[PDB]
Amino acid sequence: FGTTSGFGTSGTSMFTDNHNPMKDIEVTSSPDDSIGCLSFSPPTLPGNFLIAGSWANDVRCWEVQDSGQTIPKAQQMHTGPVLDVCWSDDGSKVFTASCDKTAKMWDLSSNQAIQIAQHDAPVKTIHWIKAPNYSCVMTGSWDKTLKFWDTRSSNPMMVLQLPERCYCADVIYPMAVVATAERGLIVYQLENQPSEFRRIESPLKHQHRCVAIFKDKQNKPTGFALGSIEGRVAIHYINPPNPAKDNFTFKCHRSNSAPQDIYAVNGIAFHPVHGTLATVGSDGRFSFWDKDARTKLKTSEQLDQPISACCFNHNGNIFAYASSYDWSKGHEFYNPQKKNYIFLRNAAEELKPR
């Protein structure tokens, strides 16, 4: 019921700016400051709803129609920049994590939000864990802790100590992976209760930035991709038959006699059907990759500012990416008057290996 791919194509007259060189769909009424995070609704919700958090302290929700029309639906406010957002598996709740040191649970139908988590520093990551025996929210913070919350009591149901400040995380039950400052990298198992499973010597020599878990042929979490500030991504299997050959890195988000410019990898997401992946970078490009054949499927034209975040909708028929300054060159290159965009693309067949 409806189109698999429906945005169509923008035309230029038969007979001028670099904000949208792919001419992707532009989300209506975009946030007023840089976008930190994007998250699409789970398959339990009919239709597609997008959440974005920004450095103006707001979280916004849009309905995304098959045609590419986007309708603003609702918004909530933190008192500091929103660093991460996610959904409950039933699609009723959006969870939000902020520099104000808290996380909120936002019930969309009643448009009410309440605090569900507290840290002693900014909350960098937030995920919903649905296990057979329990359900909880996991938060990771620059206070060097990982905490787990039932959403009802203000006491955490568990507190795990991290080796350093939480920089990124992902969860696909029964696996969680967390990357920290000083190249810390830890995999957790989540069966019965969360516990540390393996501390991994980083496959990357530079500051960790983003991470996404991928699944094997049986649909079980089996590895993750990890991006650094140094235009490189590691593909890392948990238990491969030949680690020295099966685990590998590849270069990306570089430009180019003259020196090659190296940019940060800001986001990484796997296509939920094809198991291929998208990366987005401080170079203002997105790339699509096949980690099995070890190929690049596509690189975008270059935007006039960094791409700060990306995600797929539940079936991967829509790829969303945010055009926002990422502070990669510090405050001197922040232009508070330059517009922020969320762009949408029907990229499913671009992500399907031939």
Partner: protein, 51 residues
């Protein structure tokens, strides 16, 4: 606090087999900034109103 020190991209080397020079276009690649993430530096600047 924040990004008071001017940005200057660290130079380096790699190969592609040809030897290449590189410039790292990320502030946290600088020695002065290596102990913090982009988000931590940004929050510091926001708090100090150095936008």
């Amino acid at each position: 606090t924040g990004t008071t020190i001017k940005f200057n991209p660290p130079t380096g080397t790699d190969t592609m087999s040809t030897n290449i020079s590189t410039k790292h276009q990320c502030i946290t690649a600088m020695k002065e900034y290596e102990s913090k993430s982009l988000e931590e530096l940004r929050l510091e600047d926001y708090q100090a109103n150095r936008k």
